[PDB]
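Support case: calcium ion complex. Customer-provided input:
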Amino acid sequence: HTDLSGKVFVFPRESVTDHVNLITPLEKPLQNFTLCFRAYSDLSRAYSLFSYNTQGRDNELLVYKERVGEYSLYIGRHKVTSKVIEKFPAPVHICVSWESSSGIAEFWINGTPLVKKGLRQGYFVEAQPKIVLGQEQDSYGGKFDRSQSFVGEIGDLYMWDSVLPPENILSAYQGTPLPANILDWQALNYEIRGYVIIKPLVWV
Amino acid sequence: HTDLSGKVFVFPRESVTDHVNLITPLEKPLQNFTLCFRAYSDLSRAYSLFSYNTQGRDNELLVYKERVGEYSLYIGRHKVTSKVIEKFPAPVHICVSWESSSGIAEFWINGTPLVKKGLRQGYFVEAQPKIVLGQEQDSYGGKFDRSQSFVGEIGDLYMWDSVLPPENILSAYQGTPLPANILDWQALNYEIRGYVIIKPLVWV
Amino acid sequence: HTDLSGKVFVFPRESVTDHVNLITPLEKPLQNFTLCFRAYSDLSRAYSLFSYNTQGRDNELLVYKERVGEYSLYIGRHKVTSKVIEKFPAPVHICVSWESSSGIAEFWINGTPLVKKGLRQGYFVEAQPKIVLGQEQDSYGGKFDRSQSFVGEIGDLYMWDSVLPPENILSAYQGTPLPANILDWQALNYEIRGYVIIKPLVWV
Amino acid sequence: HTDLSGKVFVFPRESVTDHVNLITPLEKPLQNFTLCFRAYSDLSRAYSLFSYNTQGRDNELLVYKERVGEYSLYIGRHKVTSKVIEKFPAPVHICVSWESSSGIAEFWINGTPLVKKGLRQGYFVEAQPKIVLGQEQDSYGGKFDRSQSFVGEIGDLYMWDSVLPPENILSAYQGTPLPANILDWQALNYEIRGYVIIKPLVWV
Amino acid sequence: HTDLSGKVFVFPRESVTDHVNLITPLEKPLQNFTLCFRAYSDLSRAYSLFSYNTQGRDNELLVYKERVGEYSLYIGRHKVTSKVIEKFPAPVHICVSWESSSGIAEFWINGTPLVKKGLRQGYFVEAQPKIVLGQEQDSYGGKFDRSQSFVGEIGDLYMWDSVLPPENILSAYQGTPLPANILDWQALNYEIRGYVIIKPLVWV
Ligand SMILES: C[C@]1(C(=O)O)OC[C@@H](OC(=O)NCCNC(=O)O[C@H]2CO[C@@](C)(C(=O)O)OC2)CO1
Ligand SMILES: C[C@]1(C(=O)O)OC[C@@H](OC(=O)NCCNC(=O)O[C@H]2CO[C@@](C)(C(=O)O)OC2)CO1
Ligand SMILES: C[C@]1(C(=O)O)OC[C@@H](OC(=O)NCCNC(=O)O[C@H]2CO[C@@](C)(C(=O)O)OC2)CO1
Ligand SMILES: C[C@]1(C(=O)O)OC[C@@H](OC(=O)NCCNC(=O)O[C@H]2CO[C@@](C)(C(=O)O)OC2)CO1
Ligand SMILES: C[C@]1(C(=O)O)OC[C@@H](OC(=O)NCCNC(=O)O[C@H]2CO[C@@](C)(C(=O)O)OC2)CO1
Ligand SMILES: [Ca+2]
Ligand SMILES: [Ca+2]
Ligand SMILES: [Ca+2]
Ligand SMILES: [Ca+2]
Ligand SMILES: [Ca+2]
Ligand SMILES: [Ca+2]
Ligand SMILES: [Ca+2]
Ligand SMILES: [Ca+2]
Ligand SMILES: [Ca+2]
Ligand SMILES: [Ca+2]
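Agent response - structure generated as follows:
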């Protein structure tokens, strides 16, 4: 468990191999969540930002960037997509929440809410996941795809087991995130596989 | 009747069934009206914003968004269209008024007056309407069309039986609208059908 | 004659019929003139803004908008065209002057001088005109063309029998035009024909 | 000689005929020069701004505008071209210097230096020129080309027999140029031929 | 040899011959380095900014501009590319660092950090280089290519044998660079070959 404050994971190249495994202490199925992180990439093609798979379930929870200005959330294989005006290339802060009771998914880009969408109302995302950054999973922990690899820098990743109110989203965006009980950048259990470098964050 | 202050209807998905029925004691034929509301959608295709049909009368009163930067009003099946510069996607405040005696239709977009157009001078829009959000009607209450469905968020919807002067339009835009006697967001009678979720308004 | 201060003509629809006739007490041939007015239209196709014909003479004096960013003046069937950066759609203030002795035509868009052009040096534009707003004449008083009709709003129309200096152009733009002897918005002699509505000017 | 302070040459129409001859008593071949002037044109096609020909020598010194954002200097039939971001149409202040010893040509657009280019190092531009505004010469004083004619307004033209330092360039742009010894707007010997009109400068 | 403060190399024309050799007594293979310089060119095609070759080694260290908004670093024949929003044409300040131990390459454009990339981790860039400005080498000191030549102005060139922290990059951008131990603009050992002119820096 490492304090990565002020630091990013650099995925310096395209590969089918470089990734970071994220280990969460959570062992119960997810009804509600919020996921925030910072990314800086100049890929124009599609890539996975956050890949969460469970046994026999691809795309159980997936944050996927299809193209510039477009963000997709997959819950249990089902997908929503929301659009935003953004410059390319540019650093970005991304928060996404999802609520089982309503099905509502909320993207926040640089503290700006995108249009709400809804999917998988009543569903629970399964526990005991494999979580990977830098690659998209098609199996429980593997079956990566070069054309979906993340190339660039990721920092300030937090994941909470609740839907964060606007004020806590903005706080995360501004660099004072509330401590997070699923994944916390300041106490992160992770394994680097292949070519991933930890560097100071210089682009905020 | 519900006070919806600070809240929105979220139509979280494309469908042919998700809609809200708006209930009003409108018994007298309309010679004059103003309709104001806020909307936030990232659809690029055409969609109905506000659909009002009467017995044997399609498109009796319809606010229809043909494409980005173009707003159409239908009165008694007749149509006018006006253009504006806008960003996409972006939250928008829309006011539209119409006046029988001159036939003049006025769109106001984020407090900004569009070019006046005119239609159905001397006409009275029929009473006893079925008013629906989220779908466009082709019958008296039904005959919805998936390709015309509204996906996104609608809030702050008011409707008056008179033509609002510019200062009152601006008041609505700024969030202090005058009391409204046809539809009022702070005392709204409505029916949710299918997948519509009420959420706080976070994008104003 | 009417004081049209704070008011516009609204030509609410495309037609081959709707127009306003303007009556001048001029009688003398024009060697010098300035014409100023405001217009708000979201037409993209070409249209006539100000059509002045005499017996047996088409396009004796015509202000014609070919396309966005381009303004044409016709004097005695001859034309010049000048370009400008403008937003679309957008309210605009237009002044045009012409001086026989030099032939110089000056367009002023929102108090901004366009490139000077020149035509019909030594020519006298004929008196006893039919002057129309909303349609382009191909005869003396008629032969209108739907594809040249003006749809939108026109206000603050003044015409002088002299070439206004930049100061006077700016004054008119900023809302205090010098007293005008050919045509005067504050004492206008006009005939409405077909669908033209007088409304308060709300876009300035 | 005429003091043209506050005045421009207006070339109000395209032609193969309209031009201004500029007269200088220069008998000594040019080793160094700076040329500054103001131009306002809405031509999109190529045009000559300043044409300097000597006997049996085309394009001895030529300032030619190929298209928007690109300025060309010809010295002794050789060419350099430099690019700039500019709006269109827009008034522009242009300075260009050339230095034989280095061959360096410097364009300055609205007081902004363009990328330096180099041509004809060691060369002397020939004396006893015919200098024309409004047309491009292909002979000694004539052989004009309609498609190269300048339509628009030129003012504040000065030419020095030395390379001006940046400070004197900014001075020219700001409207306080140093006295010039080849050509001087405030003591200009010229011949108008065809349709060219002197008018006040209104666009600065 | 030679304080070039306040001065630039001007490469005034396209050629296969015009270049500047930069001489340094570097005998130790580089593990870490930072290179900073100022460039101003209106070339649209690809060109080499900084060409560093060793005996039998092409593209040992090379800064290459593929197209507008795209910067490439070659280390030992391998390359990375990073993208940026930039105006064209425009003066630019470029810093690039590379670090053997991590393989990380950092581009800084006008003091703005680009997305980090990585190449040749564990590699040492060879010493005893031929370093040239204005041309790209394919041999040890020669084999130039006209389609790769730099046309324009270069100044403020510094090279350090370490990775400069962001603060030091900004200092170089602001015009107060730290003394550099490989290449220093204020004490530069150079050889001008062909048409290269030293001029004052006027675009900073
Ligand atoms: C004939 C038919 C069909 O059965 O209808 O199958 C082939 C084809 O349909 C597909 O190929 N469907 C799957 C498309 N793949 C896709 O959308 O992948 C997305 C979601 O999954 C990820 C994120 C992934 O897990 O790698 O990649 C991007 C056309 O329709
Ligand atoms: C041959 C002919 C003709 O008879 O002239 O008929 C077929 C075709 O004409 C039409 O299809 N006309 C109706 C077009 N439909 C239309 O404009 O729908 C609009 C208005 O109504 C709504 C808003 C609607 O109520 O769904 O949808 C978009 C071409 O012309
Ligand atoms: C063969 C020939 C010729 O004789 O050269 O005649 C037919 C054709 O030339 C024309 O048709 N010329 C007249 C074009 N009409 C035109 O420019 O109308 C303009 C000006 O007048 C207005 C403003 C109008 O008054 O309606 O409409 C646009 C090609 O050349
Ligand atoms: C066969 C050959 C050749 O002999 O190499 O000559 C004909 C052709 O090359 C040219 O025609 N070159 C001259 C083209 N004209 C040109 O560049 O005009 C420029 C420069 O001169 C001015 C400024 C002018 O003086 O009119 O107009 C624009 C192809 O190459
Ligand atoms: C057949 C094959 C192959 O063997 O794979 O070689 C020929 C072709 O591949 C190339 O030609 N590759 C090299 C192309 N040149 C290139 O990428 O130049 C870059 C890098 O080198 C510089 C900087 C240079 O040193 O000139 O120019 C730009 C297709 O693939
Ligand atoms: Ca997958
Ligand atoms: Ca995959
Ligand atoms: Ca309908
Ligand atoms: Ca329908
Ligand atoms: Ca006509
Ligand atoms: Ca006509
Ligand atoms: Ca010539
Ligand atoms: Ca020529
Ligand atoms: Ca090479
Ligand atoms: Ca090469």
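The pocket of calcium ion (ligand 8) is lined by residues B 58-59, 136-138 (CB under 6 Å).

Case will auto-close in a few days if no follow-up is received.
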